Amino acid sequence: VEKFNAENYWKKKGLAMVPLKFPVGLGSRAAGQAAALVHIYLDGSVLVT
């Protein structure tokens, strides 16, 4: 890219690198609570929500 930019006046290249620390979590324990409901019918099939 440095080589290119030394040889080209009206077109330039660039490169960048950025790192990531992305934390995950909500404000309280209560905000992270979660629930489900599961049925098993007599033919063995399952309905979940």
Binding site: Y41, L42, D43, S45
Partner: protein
């Protein structure tokens, strides 16, 4: 001893509504036994319950 008509004032009545996804059917029916309706409809359609 003679027989007898049930003579419920609401006659036999139902509405069967396919959702259009995964062969899901919803059955709105005047019955005393929903689980049995679910079985005979699923069986008839060769679907899980």
């Amino acid at each position: 001893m003679g027989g007898q008509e049930h003579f419920y004032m609401e006659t036999q009545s139902m509405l069967v509504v396919p959702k259009g996804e995964d062969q899901e059917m919803d059955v709105y029916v005047s019955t005393q036994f929903p689980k049995y309706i679910q079985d005979i409809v699923a069986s008839t359609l060769k679907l899980p319950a």
